Design brief:
part of a larger assembly; 4 chains; C: 127 residues; three-stranded parallel sheet; 3 helices; D: 106 residues; mainly beta; six-stranded antiparallel barrel; binds magnesium ion; RNA-binding; ribosomal protein (chain A); ubl conjugation (chain A); cytoplasm (chain A); acetylation (chain A); phosphoprotein (chain A)
RNA sequence: UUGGCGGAAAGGCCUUGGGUGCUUGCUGGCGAAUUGCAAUGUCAUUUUGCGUGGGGAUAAAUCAUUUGUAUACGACUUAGA
RNA sequence: GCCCUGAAAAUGGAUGGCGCUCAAGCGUGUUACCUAUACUCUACCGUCAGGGUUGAUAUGAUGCCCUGACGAGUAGGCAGGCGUGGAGGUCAGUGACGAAGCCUAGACCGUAAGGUCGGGUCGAACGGCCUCUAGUGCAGAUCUUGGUGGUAGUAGCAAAUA
RNA sequence: GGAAUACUGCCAGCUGGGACUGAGGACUGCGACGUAAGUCAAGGAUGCUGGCAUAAUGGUUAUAUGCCGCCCGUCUUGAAA
RNA sequence: GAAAUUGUUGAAAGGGAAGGGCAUUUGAUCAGACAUGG
């Protein structure tokens, strides 16, 4: 032959995995993520956009709204770890929000009419609350950018 | 933090200033040094005149041409102290040194641009009072430099110009104050005040 | 088409080229350990060629594995090939260089049939 | 919005090194605005980018990025250490670099 | 566009007159999504070749030959419509 | 105590260099920071040691499996292996539909000696495995024979009248 | 006279940020919390989401960049000599 | 029909040798993957 055949050959039986022990416990957010808190997004498509926190969801994310009619950002998912939690807050008492969950955003282009109509519903309430305080509406439309002489490790936000 | 930093090297101590500049380059900050002839050196004039003469007496015996090169101008004296603190024989070295310009007097592009000082190299700050020291431009004509009077002449001329520039500017900021006043005490004023502004 | 096997680590991938094989043509690249009394290599001064020692010995569990997943087995004909039937997630075939163009169509065939992998198809391959 | 920047400006100073041996695997970054280690703690873990130009287009782009994060403080004056996925080119000592505000705990 | 000033490397600076876009000084009407939870994003300026439409300008150096204020050879210095 | 004198040698030079004067000097003290092949934890290789285990039960019992510790090296000792000519045996082994040989910043395997493969070139023979055997591995020996460079288009080709 | 505080030490006191690792591969062990059924951070990582197609990534190679590297062989206490 | 050595073509680098080590940029090159309803 071209080579003396092996004397062994291992077992082609792919074995099972050991009973792993990693429960999946809930994620407690940091004490600065109160729903209705204005958030600075730091990455992705709407980086720099100032934005209002709506709801923790089960894939650890945050429900964001913009609101759309203020700065163009939709009801959206966002990861806590790419967000500066500012120290301004809007009341979120008038806002439904309980219909929104993971499966809402589920990958099942065009835009559903539901998304569009839900937007207006949630938005108009937030916009209603935003207007009770001056220059908050503008502040939301302006983008955040660090300036010459800003040192993040000092700034309050 | 700035693209270029221009240093009025007046009243500074040669090697300390040299030192900060050599680091500033190696980290990629473009630097121009100006008024290199009003650079200071600790110790009385004679000592440094003597020290320089040592430097002079060093030359390749078989061909003084390839010998250590004794540059006599203040800029060039100062550039020596700097090169000594950079690894100039490597590309990184050369690159750093290409971010540096040194001038005697302050020539035209810079003459109308802000210069800074380097407090940790300021003679007046560092040197103990009473302690004697040396002026570079005076050290230089001492050991051969040819342009001490030509620079002083162009400097006095720049100084006239720069001060009428300043007289006019100071007269303008007066105006904006006496423009301001009206709104210095306005309602918006008070609101800004509430914020540190 | 192959087993588990952990992430194949290689530890030291460059060749080990005999000292001064880059100096003189007469000195082959094939490794040879420096013996001479002063030699900087044998004495291991900083900044020289590293020498082979058992520390580079590869993981017992991913050793001999080609990137695919299988130890390669030299195969010179059909019967040679057919040793590998049961052990198809473990080995692949390399058709010995000296196998005629016409015979390699056969072994490629039977392999196909048997689900056996071939490391070097495209043999003396037309087109 | 003349300003669009969501990062702090950095310079690439050195590899980690002794007097005569360098470790390419770690880079010493100098974060603008950071004087002391106490400050530089803010940025630990935060992602760095070096951004360079090329000739060959890739993702329809002639601009590229080398990514990595700030990992530990260095020395007494706010210099900080960093590892990148690959390892910065050393031609880049004294080049600009970018330190982002994420991962955030603000 | 009206005046000026700048020669240290000035190649830049102030000033006069309108024209034009923007104006977040203020008050409204719209837009943004789906780039899907970060990757991937504003394009800066060098050269260099080609393309067009306009304005423009229309030579010299070398080889060779020659001089000998020059010369080992190159080089130097002359001369030739 | 520090500083000054005492203090003179031959290329131009050395607190390592620059340069430093309430030091970047001398004495002392307080903290922080940088960094070896060392120390601590973990993966992997090997070596050594201790243990489990063919009880009827497919594929290595010089094996599989569990555990701990250790790793510098000339001269030198032993061990495990790689490569070459020829011999017994066996793959009813490869081959003119292309052996061997050669070339190849092409591929894969081995810590390594090396092995394997593609493309090219070629043209009649040649492998693997168990063993046997030695005229068995080169960088050196002012080694042997042969072949070739740099030197270099260089020294030079100027005695004897033309 | 009654306190505070510093300094030092202890806690099987509570907590934030950052880094490297994830070997093993059914079960068997020691526990923990539970009234219980059960649950667990208890003899070694899982879960969720996303990216990649003449590509993400990895190997080789050339070059550049930072640091580092004297000529081997030999006799010798000592060799780049 | 090897090597030394050489011409040509093509690629690259070169401020008083060249060559080597760790690391990465940049270029060239090369891979390992494959099977899921139409
Ligand atoms: Mg808007
Ligand atoms: Mg001084
Ligand atoms: Mg050096
Ligand atoms: Mg010795
Ligand atoms: Mg370091
Ligand atoms: Mg200039
Ligand atoms: Mg990112
Ligand atoms: Mg003459
Ligand atoms: Mg003497
Ligand atoms: Mg001397
Ligand atoms: Mg002493
Ligand atoms: Mg001291
Ligand atoms: Mg002390
Ligand atoms: Mg180690
Ligand atoms: Mg040993
Ligand atoms: Mg053998
Ligand atoms: Mg043999
Ligand atoms: Mg023989
Ligand atoms: Mg047999
Ligand atoms: Mg052949
Ligand atoms: Mg024949
Ligand atoms: Mg034998
Ligand atoms: Mg013989
Ligand atoms: Mg012999
Ligand atoms: Mg030989
Ligand atoms: Mg020899
Ligand atoms: Mg020898
Ligand atoms: Mg000839
Ligand atoms: Mg001749
Ligand atoms: Mg002769
Ligand atoms: Mg595992
Ligand atoms: Mg690929
Ligand atoms: Mg190379
Ligand atoms: Mg060196
Ligand atoms: Mg060197
Ligand atoms: Mg002797
Ligand atoms: Mg020796
Ligand atoms: Mg022939």
């Amino acid at each position: 032959s071209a080579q003396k055949a092996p004397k062994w050959y291992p077992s082609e039986d792919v074995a099972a995995l050991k009973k792993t022990r990693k429960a999946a416990r809930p994620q407690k957010l940091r004490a600065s993520l109160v729903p209705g808190t204005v958030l600075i997004l730091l990455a992705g498509r709407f980086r720099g956009k100032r934005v209002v926190y709506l709801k923790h969801l089960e894939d650890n994310t945050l429900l964001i709204s913009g609101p759309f009619k203020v700065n163009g950002v939709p009801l959206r998912r966002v990861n806590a770890r790419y967000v500066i939690a500012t120290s301004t807050k809007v009341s979120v008492e008038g806002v439904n929000v309980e219909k929104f969950n993971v499966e809402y955003f589920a990958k099942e282009k065009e835009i559903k009419a539901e998304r569009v109509e839900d937007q207006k519903v949630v938005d108009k309430a937030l916009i209603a609350e935003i207007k009770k305080t001056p220059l908050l509406k503008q502040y939301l439309s302006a983008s955040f950018s660090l300036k010459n002489g800003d040192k993040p490790h000092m700034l309050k936000f | 933090v700035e693209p270029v930093v221009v240093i009025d090297g007046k009243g500074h101590l040669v090697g300390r200033l040299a030192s900060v500049v050599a680091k500033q380059l190696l980290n990629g900050q473009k630097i121009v040094v100006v008024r290199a002839e009003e650079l200071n050196i600790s110790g009385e004039f004679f000592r440094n005149k003597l020290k320089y003469h040592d430097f002079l007496r060093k030359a390749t015996a078989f061909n003084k041409t390839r010998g250590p090169f004794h540059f006599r101008a203040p800029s060039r004296i100062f550039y020596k102290a700097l090169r000594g603190m950079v690894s100039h024989k490597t590309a990184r070295g050369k690159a750093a040194l290409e971010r540096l310009k040194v001038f005697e007097g302050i020539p035209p592009p810079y003459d109308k641009k802000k210069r800074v000082v380097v407090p940790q190299a300021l003679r007046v700050l560092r040197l103990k009072p009473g302690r004697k020291y040396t002026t570079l431009g005076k050290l230089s004509t001492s050991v051969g430099w040819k342009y001490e009077d030509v620079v002083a002449k162009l400097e006095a001329k720049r100084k006239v110009s720069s001060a009428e520039y300043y007289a006019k500017k100071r007269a303008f900021t007066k105006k904006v104050a006496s423009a301001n006043a009206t709104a210095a005490e306005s309602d918006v004023a008070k609101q800004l005040a509430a914020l540190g502004y | 088409a192959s087993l588990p096997h952990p992430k194949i680590v290689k530890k030291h991938t460059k060749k080990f080229k005999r000292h001064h094989s880059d100096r003189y043509h007469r000195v082959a690249e094939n490794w040879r350990k420096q013996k001479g009394i002063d030699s900087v290599v044998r004495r291991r001064f900083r900044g020289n060629i590293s020498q082979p020692k058992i520390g580079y010995g590869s993981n017992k569990k991913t050793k001999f594995l080609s990137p695919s997943g299988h130890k390669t087995f030299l195969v010179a004909n059909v019967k040679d090939l057919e040793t590998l039937t049961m052990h198809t997630k473990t080995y692949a075939a390399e058709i010995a260089h000296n196998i005629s163009a016409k015979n390699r169509v056969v072994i490629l065939a039977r392999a196909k049939a048997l689900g056996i992998k071939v490391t070097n198809p495209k043999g003396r391959l037309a087109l | 919005a003349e300003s669009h920047r969501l990062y702090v400006k950095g310079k690439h100073l050195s590899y980690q090194r002794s007097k005569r041996v360098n470790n390419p695997n770690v880079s010493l970054i100098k974060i603008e605005g950071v004087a002391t280690p106490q400050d530089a703690q803010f940025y630990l873990g935060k992602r760095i980018a070096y951004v360079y130009r090329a000739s060959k287009e890739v993702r329809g782009s002639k601009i590229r990025v080398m990514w990595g994060k700030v990992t530990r403080t260095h020395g007494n004056s706010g210099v900080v250490r960093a590892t990148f996925r690959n390892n910065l080119p050393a031609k880049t000592f004294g080049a600009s670099v970018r330190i982002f505000l994420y991962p955030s705990n603000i």
